[PDB]
Amino acid sequence: ESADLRALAKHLYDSYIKSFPLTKAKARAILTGKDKSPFVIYDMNSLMMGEDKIKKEVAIRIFQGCQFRSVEAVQEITEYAKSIPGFVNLDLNDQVTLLKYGVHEIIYTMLASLMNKDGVLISEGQGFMTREFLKSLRKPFGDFMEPKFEFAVKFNALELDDSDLAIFIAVIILSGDRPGLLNVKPIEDIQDNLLQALELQLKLNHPESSQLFAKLLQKMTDLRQIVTEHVQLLQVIKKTHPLLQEIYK
Amino acid sequence: ESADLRALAKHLYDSYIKSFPLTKAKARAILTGKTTDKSPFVIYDMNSLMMGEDKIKEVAIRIFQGCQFRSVEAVQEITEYAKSIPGFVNLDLNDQVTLLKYGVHEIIYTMLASLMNKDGVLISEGQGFMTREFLKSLRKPFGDFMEPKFEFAVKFNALELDDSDLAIFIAVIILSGDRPGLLNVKPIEDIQDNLLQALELQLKLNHPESSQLFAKLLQKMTDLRQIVTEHVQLLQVIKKTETDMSLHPLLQEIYKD
Numbered sequence A: 001e002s003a004d005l006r007a008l009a010k011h012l013y014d015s016y017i018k019s020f021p022l023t024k025a026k027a028r029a030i031l032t033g034k035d036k037s038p039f040v041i042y043d044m045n046s047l048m049m050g051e052d053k054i055k056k057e058v059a060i061r062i063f064q065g066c067q068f069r070s071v072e073a074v075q076e077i078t079e080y081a082k083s084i085p086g087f088v089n090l091d092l093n094d095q096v097t098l099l100k101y102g103v104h105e106i107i108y109t110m111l112a113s114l115m116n117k118d119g120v121l122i123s124e125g126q127g128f129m130t131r132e133f134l135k136s137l138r139k140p141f142g143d144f145m146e147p148k149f150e151f152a153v154k155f156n157a158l159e160l161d162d163s164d165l166a167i168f169i170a171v172i173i174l175s176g177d178r179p180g181l182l183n184v185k186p187i188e189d190i191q192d193n194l195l196q197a198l199e200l201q202l203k204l205n206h207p208e209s210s211q212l213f214a215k216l217l218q219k220m221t222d223l224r225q226i227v228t229e230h231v232q233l234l235q236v237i238k239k240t241h242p243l244l245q246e247i248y249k
Numbered sequence B: 001e002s003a004d005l006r007a008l009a010k011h012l013y014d015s016y017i018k019s020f021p022l023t024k025a026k027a028r029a030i031l032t033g034k035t036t037d038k039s040p041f042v043i044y045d046m047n048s049l050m051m052g053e054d055k056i057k058e059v060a061i062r063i064f065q066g067c068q069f070r071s072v073e074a075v076q077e078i079t080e081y082a083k084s085i086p087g088f089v090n091l092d093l094n095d096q097v098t099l100l101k102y103g104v105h106e107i108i109y110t111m112l113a114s115l116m117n118k119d120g121v122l123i124s125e126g127q128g129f130m131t132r133e134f135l136k137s138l139r140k141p142f143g144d145f146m147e148p149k150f151e152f153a154v155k156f157n158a159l160e161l162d163d164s165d166l167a168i169f170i171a172v173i174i175l176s177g178d179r180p181g182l183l184n185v186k187p188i189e190d191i192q193d194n195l196l197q198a199l200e201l202q203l204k205l206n207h208p209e210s211s212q213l214f215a216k217l218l219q220k221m222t223d224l225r226q227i228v229t230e231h232v233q234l235l236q237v238i239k240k241t242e243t244d245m246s247l248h249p250l251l252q253e254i255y256k257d
Helices: A002-019 A024-032 A044-053 A058-082 A092-113 A131-136 A146-156 A162-173 A184-205 A212-237 A242-248 B002-019 B024-032 B046-054 B059-083 B093-113 B132-137 B147-157 B163-174 B185-206 B213-241 B249-255
Strands: A039-041 A119-122 A127-130 B041-043 B120-123 B128-131
Touching (some): A002 A184, A058 A092, A058 B002, A092 A146, A092 A162, A092 A212, A092 B002, A127 A131, A131 A146, A146 A212, A162 A184, A162 A212, A184 A212, A242 B059, A242 B093, A242 B249, B002 B059, B024 B163, B041 B046, B093 B163, B093 B213, B093 B249, B132 B147, B163 B185, B163 B213, B185 B213
Parallel strands (some): B041 B128
16 A cells, blocks of 8 residues: 555654754755854864864874764664664564664765765764865875765765655665575565655655666665775774773774 | 653663673573573582583682673673663763763673572573682682672562663663763763663563562662772782782773772
């Protein structure tokens, strides 16, 4: 019943809005942008001044922060997943499994919302870090962001919005291919529903955008590549406080 | 609204099950004999201790190290759980470190009671059971190292809490505003306020008969603190008597105060 679907969509959206503080509309507005400009971090002095005004070696602290941020996001995402109908009824191991392998894909999805071709919003919108400043950092820290920027420019050309992204995100989480899943069938049963809901959503929200659905699903490919590429970079950083380390694992 | 507090209770219980492999429900099933496949090997003496190693350098020292490596793991499990507490992850990163630093031993001894009866304590993910008397036998200063924990457990287990209750209790312990050296007390207190309210409701619904369970549970926090202090004291003794015993940096970091 397109109406069963319409309800799923709305619910996921409302859950999305509750779960994630900085949304795409909000991010867009600040980028474009509607109120107070964000503090702009375009080099080392700006960074130093930024930090004195707002919330060791520089390159490392920025790479670590990106971690604190990804940990935050894991919890937001994890809370969002629990709003997805069916999710909490799956085998607990499988919920853990679904999150474990899906979070990074969703982090980069959502981080596109905060990126344009020149920088990326940070500190929940208070700062803006330039692409060129991040690219400047000494190796291997000059490269970590750059594949996210190239994905984000492509992904943002879809001009998806928050209501679309809410459903896409849920589709990701419910991937029945994740390794180690105990009971794939309810996962795919839900995803299949999420897919119908996303498909109908994009037909109604972008009636002019031919095969947007398919195009968005094709981007999943780009996302996995990015994540795979990042764990690869990460092992290399493993070649560069006990308790704080435990937090980021 | 109560409804929110219930949502939060369920979320925490769920994380707790995910974060902690040996729940109280599993430990009691092993302890009470709801088992044919779940039965533990019992160590009540040196001889039995040796047989135990078979199917699971002085003894006392060994037993103590194992206890510290298990504690180091538990630090990890609790840290994992901690990240699940709504708001925790958002707090200043230094405060997050502080709350864990001062919370983890309290939590450790809370969750240990789960694994204890008056006779002894489960070990090795519950495949073994080390009697209280054996642990008491050990050469000084180790002989007394567990005893205060047993005494607390015997008393705390008298509350008959289950995993869904401890999940919230533990949360409350972590999000303590009073902890020393905290940068932003307010955002911590607000979270604890919630958790306390979640806890109160949870005990009311789960234990409708149990009058003032909430207060009695909160009072227990007092004996927890004291266990931790005595333990810290005993550790300073052991580090001095045994110059050849190594204490994990994590734990050494935590004991710094």
